[PDB]
Amino acid sequence: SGLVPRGSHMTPDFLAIKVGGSLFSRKDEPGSLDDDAVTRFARNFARLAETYRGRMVLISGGGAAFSLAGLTEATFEVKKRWAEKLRGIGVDAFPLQLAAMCTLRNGIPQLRSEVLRDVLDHGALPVLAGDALFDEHGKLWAFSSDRVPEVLLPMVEGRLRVVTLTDVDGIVTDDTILPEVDARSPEQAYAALWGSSGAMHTKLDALVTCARRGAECFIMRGDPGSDLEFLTAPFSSWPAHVRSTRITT
């Protein structure tokens, strides 16, 4: 509860990188991943993981009453595919079932397993994804990958950077990207989604939630072969070609 120095000149202490399903699969082609995209992304994620050893999670999107239980199995497969690929290039990537670690209480995700923190402290790379989570009444709910960074908020010390890679450069207004969103008052960003129609709304809600708890959050375009080293760097030092929507408080 100490004073945390923050700003565009500061280096993040922790990276939560989420890779959208759009970027490595097609809905028209169920349970089929684009292996080339996974391969190329994995190379870039591997470099980040070495710098942020024990200070990063990779969150995968994608993945095919109690019937929702199949979701846990579907998203486990996606985590396996990333982790296998990453281990193949020397990263200590370990998939973790969020449903075994987290439950919902009054709608808020609750981390209920100490294992995630231990895995990080051991210097491994947790590979996470969305899931089917139980609430306090025993009902299952689909918990989007986009919301996984929320589960990190009480656990991460220091400066959390959350980056959601998607198939657009940010929040589009009209015609142009919105470069900055103030999480204390983001009504303009929500108004832009209404202009352009719920995937991005879930992203915004999640990243506003994280930004209100100090995180530096980005919506930006992913590309399998793109160098991501700049995500280790202070925002003010980013290359000029990089486009994003930045959500902060």
Ligand X SMILES: Nc1ncnc2c1ncn2[C@@H]1O[C@H](COP(=O)(O)OP(=O)(O)O)[C@@H](O)[C@H]1O
Ligand Y SMILES: C[C@@H]1O[C@@H]1P(=O)(O)OP(=O)(O)O
Binding span for Mg ion by CB under 5 A among 100-108, 129-137, 155-163, 191-199: 191-199
Q: Min. distance of Cβ 78 from a copy of itself in angstroms?
A: 11
Is residue 148 part of an annotated ligand binding site?
no
Binding span for Mg ion by CB under 5 A among 118-126, 154-162, 197-205, 225-233: 197-205
Instruction: List binders of ligand Y among 188-207 (CB under 6 A).
Output: 199
Q: Choose among ligand X, ligand Y, Mg ion, none what residue 192 binds, the Cβ cut-off being 5 to 8 Å by kind.
A: ligand X
Is residue 1 part of an annotated ligand binding site?
no
**Distance (Å, rounded) from C-alpha 227 to C-alpha 249?**
27
Identify which of residues 75 and 248 has a Cβ nearer to a copy of itself in the complex.
75
**Distance (Å, rounded) from C-alpha 45 to C-alpha 231?**
10
**Distance (Å, rounded) from C-alpha 132 to C-alpha 71?**
6
Out of 104, 172, 205, 213, the residue judged to bind ligand X by CB under 6 A: 172
- The widest CA-to-CA distance across the chain, in whole angstroms, is 49
Give strand pairing partners of 218. Answer: 163, 246
Sign of CA dihedral 17, 14, 90, 95: negative
Number of residues that bind ligand Y (CB under 6 A): 13
199 in contact with Mg ion (CB under 5 A): yes
Identify which of residues 83 and 206 has a Cβ nearer to ligand X in the complex.
206
Q: Min. distance of Cβ 21 from ligand X in angstroms?
A: 4
Structure tokens at 176: 């142009």
**Distance (Å, rounded) from C-alpha 16 to C-alpha 194?**
27
End-to-end Cα, the chain, rounded Å: 17
Q: Measuring CA to CA, which residue among 60, 68, 71 is closest to residue 33?
A: 60
Q: 180-182 and 244-248: which strand pairing?
A: parallel
Is residue 145 part of an annotated ligand binding site?
yes
Q: Choose among ligand Y, ligand X, Mg ion, none what residue 130 binds, the Cβ cut-off being 5 to 8 Å by kind.
A: ligand Y
Binding site, annotated residues: 18-22, 27, 62-63, 145, 166-167, 172, 192, 194, 196, 199, 203
Residues flagged as binding site for ADP: 18, 22, 27, 166-167, 172, 192, 194, 196, 203
